[PDB]
Amino acid sequence: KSLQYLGSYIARAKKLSRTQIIFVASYLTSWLNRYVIEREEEVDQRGGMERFKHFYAAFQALCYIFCFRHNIFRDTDGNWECELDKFFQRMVISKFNPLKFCNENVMLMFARIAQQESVAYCFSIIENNNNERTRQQFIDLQSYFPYDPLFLKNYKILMKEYYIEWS
Amino acid sequence: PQNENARAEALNLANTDSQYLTPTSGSPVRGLIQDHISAGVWLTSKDSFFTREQYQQYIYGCIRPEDGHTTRSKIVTLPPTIFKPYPLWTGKQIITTVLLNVTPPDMPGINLISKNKIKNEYWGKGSLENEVLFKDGALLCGILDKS
Amino acid sequence: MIVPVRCFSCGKVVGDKWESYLNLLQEDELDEGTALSRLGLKRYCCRRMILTHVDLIEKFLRYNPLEKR
Amino acid sequence: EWNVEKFKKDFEVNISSLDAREANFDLINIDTSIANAFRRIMISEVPSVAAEYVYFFNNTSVIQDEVLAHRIGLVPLKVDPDMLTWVDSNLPDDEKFTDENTIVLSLNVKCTRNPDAPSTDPKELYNNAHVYARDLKFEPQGRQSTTFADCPVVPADPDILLAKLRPGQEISLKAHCILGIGGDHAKFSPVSTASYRLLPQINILQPIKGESARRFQKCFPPGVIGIDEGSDEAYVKDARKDTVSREVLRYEEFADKVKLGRVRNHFIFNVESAGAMTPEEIFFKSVRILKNKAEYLKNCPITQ
Amino acid sequence: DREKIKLLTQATSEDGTSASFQIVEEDHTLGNALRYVIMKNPDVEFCGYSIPHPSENLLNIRIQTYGETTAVDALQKGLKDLMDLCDVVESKFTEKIKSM
Amino acid sequence: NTLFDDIFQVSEVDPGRYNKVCRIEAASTTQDQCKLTLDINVELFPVAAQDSLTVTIASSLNATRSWRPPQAGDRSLADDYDYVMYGTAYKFEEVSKDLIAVYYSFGGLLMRLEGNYRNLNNLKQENAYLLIRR
Ligand SMILES: [Zn+2]
C-alpha cells in the first residue's frame, strides 16, 4: 500500500517536479534492475509465486503512471525515456509472468496504448494466460487504489484545482 | 484450548502420531482391526486378481494428490504383472504402490520378515503364504492379516 | 395405525390395496397369501405392509371429545 | 483404438414387455459403469413434481398434524413435468410462488353423524367418514386455466386412506406443489424402482439326458430347462426366465456337470412407477439431462 | 457460473501434464461414467475418481497422459464422447421404441 | 536377450482351494533334476497333467522408461508368446553340489528352480519376462 501511495500521487496531479519523479524514484527503477540481477535464482525452491507482493504492485504503480501521462513519457529528441525498448521488455518471459497475476481495470488498459504507441506486445499471451491460470482474501489489498477519482460535488471546489481529466 | 500456546503442544504432543506405541508393555493399540482387515484377506491373496481399471481406481481413492501425497512430481505405478491382451494385476501389487507413492525419494524401501495367523494348511497343501517378505517394500509373498 | 403411503423402500403406494384387502378377508372368502398376491405385488418388501399393518386408529377413534360419550 | 461406430454396431437394443406400468428392457452391449448413469438418473436426478408446503388451517382429528402433513405432500401427483419450471428458493413467497411454480391444491372434509340402524360399518354410519385422495382437488391461481383443460391434475390413485374421522371433527387444509429431484426426498422419485438384473449365463458341460433330465428340471424353474427326448441333448431353452438362485449347487452331483455365470454385456431392466410417470416416458428424462449434464461441463471457463 | 471447473494447481506440473480437476455437487454419475471413456482415449496413462467427503456432494478427478496432450484437453474428448454415449441410446433406440 | 531356455513337463496339478490359481510341478525334458515350481494362473493358460511347456526367462525386449500400453505394430520379442510374467528374484539357496536352487516370485506367486546351467547367466534379478509357448 505504501508504494501504492505513489500511484495516483504522481498521475492525477499537476504540480510535480517531473525531472525529479524519475530522479527520486530512480531507486525503484534501480529496484527493477536489482530484482533481475540478484533475485532470480530462487523460484524453483520451496515456495510459490506470492512471496513478492512488492513486485506485482510497485511495478504496477509505475505502470499506473503509464496510461495517464503519455506526453510526459516522450522527450524532444525522439528516443524513449530511459530506453523503454529494453527496460519494460526484459520482464516478459521470466520466472514470474508479470502479465499473469494482474488487476482488471488498469491492468487491462494495457491493450490500447501498448500497440498504437509501440510500447509492448502481449496480444498472443492473453489467450495463454487463462489456461495455466491468506491468499483468497489477498486480492482485497491489491484491488483498491488510494487516490481514486473524486465523486462529491462541493469538495470538488477545492480539488478540481490540481486534478485533470482522462487525457 | 482457549489460548494459542496450547495449540503448540496439543498439535505436537497429544497428537496421534506420538501415541502409536503405548507405554504399558510395548504392545501397540492403534490400527484398523474390524472390517478393513478381514477384507485384507480377500484383497491381496491370489483369488483377487485385478484389471488396469481396478488397479487405477484403487489407488486414486487412496492417495488424493491434490491434498499433497506425491513427492517427485506426480503419481506413478509399476509395470503390470501379466503381459497379455489384458494386463492383469495382483492384490500383492495393490499394497505395494500405495506403500510407494508417499515416501519421499533418497530413501530405500523397507524389508520385513514376519508371520500371520493363517497357517498355510488352510490354503491347501505346500503353498507357503503364512510368511511375509518386503523386498523393497512389497508384499512379495504371503497374505497380510491381523498380525 | 394408518397405512403408510408409498411403502418404506419399494416406492409403490400400497394403500388402495388395504381396504381392498379388507374386502377380501371379510366376505370374499379368500386366503391370506394369494388374496394379498392378487393385487399387483411384484416384490416382497411390499408384502408385509398389508400382512403386518395393525390398523390402530380404532383405539384413537374411540376417544372423541368433540361428541358426547 | 476407440471408435464410436465400433460401438454403434456393438450397442444392441431389444424391448421385452413394455406397458405404461412396466417395461422389460433388453438394453444390451453396455458396461456396468453405465448401468448406474442410466439407473440413478432414473431414480433421483430426474424431475418429479410433488406437494411440499402444507398451509394448514385446522386439524381437528385424533390424527396428529405432523404425520398427516407429510402425506398430503407425499401422494403421487398425476401431473406432467415440463409444464412447470424451476422454483426460486430463498426469496419471500410473493415472487416465489407464482402460477408458474405452484399447483394450488386444497382439501376440506367436515364429517358428521348420520342416523342409521345397526360391527356397524363406519362408511355405513357417517357422512364424509373416510377422506381419500379423491377429496383433494385442484384450483388454479394466476395466469393458467387452459393448460389443465385437457387434464385436471388429479391425484394419481384416489384410494389412499388419508384419515378416518368421527363426528364432530373436521379437516380443511391447503397444500402447495413444487418440482423436486429424488436426491432431496423420496417423494420426488418418479419411479418406484429402477433396479437391474444381468442375463444369467448358465453352463453345461455334459449331456444330462436320461434320468438327470427329470432331475435337472425339478429344482430349476420349469420353463428354463428344455428336455428334448431321451436323446438330442437337452438344451436349456430360456435364459432370462430364471433367477440366479443356484439351488443346483446344493446338490452333490450337479456340482461339476453344470456351471453358471453371467453375461456382463446383456441387461434387462424393470422400471415401474406409482402412476404419475410411465416407463415409456422417462428414458428421455434420464438421458436428455445427462446429455445436458455433459455439454454444460465442457464450455465452462477454467479458473485460477 | 465459475463454480464448476476449478484447476486445483496444488497438484500440477508446469506445462500441465496432469491435474486434479475440481468439480462440485456431482456423484458417481460422472466418475463411474467418464472414467469409462477416458481410458478409450489412447493417450491416457492414468485416471480415476475420488470423494473429498462421502456425506456432502463433491468430486475430484485427475487424468494422466503422454506428450502432445495436456490435462484439460483430455477432458475435452472424454466429455465429447459422453455427448455421444447417450446419443446412441437415442439415435438407434428411437427405432426400437417405434416398432415394439 | 534370453537367459534361460528349455522344455518342461507338468507332473501334477492341485487347486489349493483357490479360484484362478493352481500349483504346478514341472520337471524337464533335457536334464533330470530341474524341477520348476509353478503357481499358474489357470484362466489365461489352461494347464493339465503332462503338457508340453517351454519355460524361457529372458530379461528385456529389444530409453526404455516403463510400461507404455501396447500400441499398434510394435516390436516385442515376447510378441510370439502369450502368458508373459514379470517379477523379481529374492532368495537363493543351495542343494547338492553343482546345483544352485533359487526362490522366485511374481506378486505372491512362488517358483523354485533347481538346476545347474543358470549359474553363468542368471542371478538375483529384477526384470524378467517369462516367454511361454503353447
Ligand atoms: Zn415391495
PDB file of N, CA and C and ligand atoms in Angstrom, chain C residues 10 43-46, ligand 1:
ATOM      1  N   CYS C  10     -39.903 -49.655  -1.282  1.00  0.00           N
ATOM      2  CA  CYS C  10     -40.315 -50.173  -2.579  1.00  0.00           C
ATOM      3  C   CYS C  10     -40.626 -49.052  -3.550  1.00  0.00           C
ATOM      4  N   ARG C  43     -42.917 -57.547  -5.538  1.00  0.00           N
ATOM      5  CA  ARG C  43     -41.781 -57.677  -4.641  1.00  0.00           C
ATOM      6  C   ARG C  43     -42.244 -58.288  -3.326  1.00  0.00           C
ATOM      7  N   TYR C  44     -41.325 -58.414  -2.365  1.00  0.00           N
ATOM      8  CA  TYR C  44     -41.737 -58.896  -1.054  1.00  0.00           C
ATOM      9  C   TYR C  44     -41.454 -57.917   0.066  1.00  0.00           C
ATOM     10  N   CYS C  45     -40.872 -56.763  -0.227  1.00  0.00           N
ATOM     11  CA  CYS C  45     -40.867 -55.722   0.786  1.00  0.00           C
ATOM     12  C   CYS C  45     -42.128 -54.885   0.724  1.00  0.00           C
ATOM     13  N   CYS C  46     -42.953 -55.083  -0.296  1.00  0.00           N
ATOM     14  CA  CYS C  46     -44.307 -54.575  -0.216  1.00  0.00           C
ATOM     15  C   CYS C  46     -45.166 -55.430   0.694  1.00  0.00           C
TER      16      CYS C  46
HETATM   17 ZN    ZN G   1     -42.124 -54.448  -2.185  1.00  0.00          ZN
END
